[PDB]
Every structure is written in structure tokens, then in C-alpha cells.
Amino acid sequence: MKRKIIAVTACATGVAHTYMAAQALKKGAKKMGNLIKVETQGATGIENELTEKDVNIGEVVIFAVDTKVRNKERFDGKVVLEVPVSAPIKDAEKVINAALALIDEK
């Protein structure tokens, strides 16, 4: 029922994107009934650092960023879904479906 997904959100100038995306994405994932780990980088400052543990829990890695990711090292090599940071704001549920499309696709 609860699919394991991790997602990184990061933007430098325009953090309103980062936070709003992380909120909407979180709401949608919870509404669908899944387990998501949303990492929030305030450009350089990571406010929710996903460790190897968390990263190995989530299978799909959603990347909604305008800037670079620091923890990306652990996410790299895993199955990811790369989208604009603005995307999970308007189409959060759609982004979640996209993540599912990388592992299952329907």
C-alpha cells in the first residue's frame, strides 16, 4: 500500500518553490497513502538530510530542484524521477504517478 519514495527539493533564489513543492508533494503522497522522504535544501543548507538508511528505504528518487544536491551521492545509482521544482506544486499527484512509472508504469 505504502510505496517507498524519496524526493529532493532544492532551490537557491526562490525558496518559495522548494518549500511549497515539499509541502504539496508531502500532502499528495500522504493522501495517496505512501511513505515519502522529502529532502529540503535551502540552496546549501539541508533541512532534512536523508541518510543512507532513508535513501535505501525509498526506491524512487524524485528530483525537483533548480540547484545542485549534496546528498545526491547516495541517490545516484537509484531509480529517479527528475522534474522542475515548480512541478510538484501544481501536479504533485502526477509527479508521484511519474515515480511509479519508473518502477512499474501504469
Of 7, 11, 69, 80, which residue is the catalytic one? 11
Residue 60 annotated to the active site:
no
Dihedral sign (CA 57, 10, 47, 52): positive
Q: For the CA atoms of 57, 34, 106, 6, what is the dihedral angle to 10 degrees?
A: -40
Task: Indicate the residue type of 55.
Answer: V
Task: Indicate the residue type of 69.
Answer: V
Which grid cell is 90?
A: 501544481
Tell me which residues are annotated as active site. Answer: 11
